[model samples]
Target: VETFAFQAEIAQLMSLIINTFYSNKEIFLRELISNSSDALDKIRYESLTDPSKLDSGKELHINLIPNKQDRTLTIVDTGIGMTKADLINNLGTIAKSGTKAFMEALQAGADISMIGQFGVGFYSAYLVAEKVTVITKHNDDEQYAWESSAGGSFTVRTDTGEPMGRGTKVILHLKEDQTEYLEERRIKEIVKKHSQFIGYPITLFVE
Candidate 1:
């Protein structure tokens, strides 16, 4: 496993986002689902030029699996997954354009709901999760797992767990106070409110 430290800016941003910016934590679901929808869109667009990209035969959809026993909530998407380098650059650093602008906006009390527009919405996961694990398989790269707690560092390693045909799975280890997110009804309500029109179907697996 290779571990990398989060960018200095990212650390500061995480502090502000988790402790200061957002008042409604449930929006974490919306941000994540929005990301999943984007990934699905990417794969569909790519498949138009190279139909082989769709060989996995998995339908484009999002799956929510909340394991009460494990205190984990997983969101799985059959979308274009990320390579190790993609994870490192995207998740390990504030490499997206407008980050400096984003920081300034956050400091100036800009609308916090536009977090996703700045590409930092992923960090909101820390609001509800003590740790987050991302397992993704890209057509050009081996399946890999990226994990972090929005702490100073994150780890990436080849995944040896169950195989995913293609796509990404984000597993949130919910904090004790955030366990309400593991409830089926609560998740459904949030999705309905925020993502009712998402192009892909979202299925919840309850036990």
Candidate 2:
């Protein structure tokens, strides 16, 4: 396992968001789903210019699975998965710098409106989860896992588990006070309330 620590600038950004938004932790669901959709948007855009990028013909979607016995929840997305360097750079820093072409797309401001006004809401996961595990695969990079407790440090390693192919799966070890995320009823309500307008289809199920 390799560990990476967040810089002070990014860490302070998180401290503020965590304290200010802790009261409404369910927002994490909406934020993560939005980010997933944005990731999908990225690959879809790339596929337009070069269809080879999406030869797998994977349909874009988001999945939520809950395990009652283990008190864990997972959110999976068939999006543009990150490489190991991408994971560390994206998660360790505040904002993402996809690439030069992506940056040009951003400057065009055409449809690059991904969490623009707001910072990375991914960090909001800390409000509801004690531990978080991210398993991701990119077509250009080997599959890997990133695990953290929302502390300053995180670990990354090659994933030996089942392959997810070009996508991402986030597993949440729910906090004691935030177990409501584990409830189907509450999940449905909050998702409908905040995620109903998301760009992609989202499914919640038991696994």
Candidate 3:
């Protein structure tokens, strides 16, 4: 299992977002769902040029699995999964100099209404989760898992779980006080509020 430290800028950015970004913690769900949709769009677009990309036979959609026993909430999507390098680069660091630009914008008191544009929406996971595990399989690469605890470092390793065709699964280990995320009704409510108009269907596993 190879480990990597988050870029210094990224580490600071995460701390900033987790500590001071959003007042409504439920926005984390919206940010994650939006990311899943973007992934789905990517795979669909890629498949257009290369039909074999869809060979996994998995339908394109998103699934939310909440395990109260494990105190985790997992978001799975049959989207364009990340390769090992993608995991390292995408999660470990932000765009070249983009983080600095973002920080500058924030410090200048710019109206930073859209966080997704900064590609830091993923850090919002720390709003409710203490740890995040990402298992993904790209069409051209082996399945891999990336894990982090918003602790300035993350690890990437071969996934030992059963073969999950093409897609990405984000498992959020919820904080003790964030158990509401594990409720089916609560998740559904959040989805309806934020993602009701999304093109792909988002399913919540129950029972």
| Model number with the top TM-score | 1
Q: Residue 129, candidate 2: how far off, in angstroms?
A: 0.5
- Candidate 2 per-residue lDDT, tens place, 1-207, comes to 998986654465445544543365677888778778888888888888988888654688899998878878899998888989888885523453333333355467722223333456676676677888999988888989998875577899999899886888989888877778888999999899988988888999954
Strongest candidate by lDDT: 1
At residue 51, what lDDT does model 3 achieve? 87
How many steric overlaps are in each model, in order? 0, 0, 0
Q: What are the lDDT scores of the predictions, listed in order?
A: 0.86, 0.75, 0.84
List ranges where model 3 is wrong by over 4 Å.
92-98, 108-113
lDDT per residue for candidate 3 within 44-113, as digits (tens), equals 9988998888898548999999999999999999998888988999642364466677777777774334
Candidate 1 vs 2: which has more lDDT: 1
Q: What's the distance in Å from true for residue 112, model 1?
A: 3.3
Off by over 4 Å in 2: 17-21, 92-116
Sorted on TM-score, best first, the list reads 1, 3, 2
Under the 3 Å rule for N, CA and C atoms, how many clashes does model 3 have? 0
As for TM-score, the candidate ahead, 2 or 3, is 3
- Candidate 1 lDDT over 8-93, as tens digits, reads 87777676666775568998899899889989999999999999999974599999999999999999999999988889986433
